[PDB]
Design an enzyme around this catalytic site. Structure first.
Site, PDB file in Angstrom:
ATOM      1  N   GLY A  18     -40.643 -28.559  26.353  1.00  0.00           N
ATOM      2  CA  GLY A  18     -40.933 -29.303  25.137  1.00  0.00           C
ATOM      3  C   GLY A  18     -40.784 -28.613  23.785  1.00  0.00           C
ATOM      4  O   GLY A  18     -39.955 -29.011  22.970  1.00  0.00           O
ATOM      5  N   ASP A  19     -41.566 -27.557  23.563  1.00  0.00           N
ATOM      6  CA  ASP A  19     -41.717 -26.925  22.238  1.00  0.00           C
ATOM      7  C   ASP A  19     -40.893 -25.667  21.948  1.00  0.00           C
ATOM      8  O   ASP A  19     -41.115 -25.009  20.926  1.00  0.00           O
ATOM      9  CB  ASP A  19     -43.195 -26.674  21.898  1.00  0.00           C
TER      10      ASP A  19
END
EC number: 3.1.-.-
Lengths: 152, 151
Positions: A18-19
């Site tokens: 995700g990040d």
DNA sequence: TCAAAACGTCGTACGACGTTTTGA
DNA sequence: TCAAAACGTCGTACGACGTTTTGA
């Protein structure tokens, strides 16, 4: 090396998916043989309030550093040997960025072989293309095919 | 009422910590007795090229749905009970969003208590704020004061 | 010459909200 | 009177590059 426990590797692979960001660059430099550096950078940009997260994150992984940009800070790992280790253990668990990690590993393992031959260098520069493609590439300037220019 | 894979819980708690969104809205509507709907949402945004990953989520979690936004896509879970279940199991593995989880949990639990005695409804609306505080809010409009002044 | 670190850059994409309808 | 879906929309990070330096 250092060998990462599976509970931790599982969480990280999620958070990286995700990040987090896997960067591959060809950096024009007059200093090198082929006058380009191959840099692999793995990075996570948090908000400086949260620096503790990136710091704990430095301490857990055991390698790399946090740079403060002002309002934002990065966790950076540019060191090749640790990077390669990190990415081998993480690769099996990556549900999204898995290919880019595999490409980083392929690039690294072949690095020495690439310093030797010009057309072998370009074969490696193409993978740092393939990596770029798997991100949303904006400001990209130096490609594999920019290199082919000077090499002639 | 599904129980979740701790392997998959860890990966997800890691994912959510990085890319996930926990949203608490006080959404005014003229229908409701107090003229507000209470709304909890856990969403994940992914470019539609990757939409399969969102489908995997609908599958692994068992509930929630994918919304095709055009060039991007959302996985939404707004159902209260499934959301309370999901967040309960996920909450211990959350690092960065840990606080938000436990608010949505404590909100959900106190929901009916709020349906009755507005002074408690207020006490709960307060919890929405504290969530909005942990995200950096941008467009935030209706708040616990906005409601209260109308109480 | 090379691995690394140090540092400069910016256009938008999307998080985190909105508002309004469905189907009870 | 609700839960839950549907659908709309904006501001400031921030990600993914970039250039330059360092020291062997």
């Amino acid at each position: 090396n250092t060998k990462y426990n599976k509970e931790f590797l599982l969480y990280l692979a999620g958070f990286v998916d995700g990040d987090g960001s896997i960067i591959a660059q060809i950096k024009p430099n007059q200093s090198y043989k082929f006058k380009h550096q191959l840099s692999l950078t793995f990075q996570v940009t948090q908000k400086t309030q949260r620096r503790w997260f990136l710091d704990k994150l430095v301490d857990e992984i055991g390698v790399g550093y946090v740079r403060d940009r002002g309002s934002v800070s990065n966790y950076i790992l540019s060191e090749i040997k640790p990077l390669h280790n990190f990415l081998t253990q993480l690769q099996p668990f990556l549900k999204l960025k898995q290919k880019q990690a595999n490409l980083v590993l392929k690039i690294i393992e072949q690095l020495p072989s690439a310093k030797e031959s010009p057309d072998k260098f370009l074969e490696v520069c193409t993978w740092v293309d393939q990596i770029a493609a798997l991100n949303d590439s904006k400001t990209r300037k130096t490609t594999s095919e920019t290199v082919r220019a000077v090499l002639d």
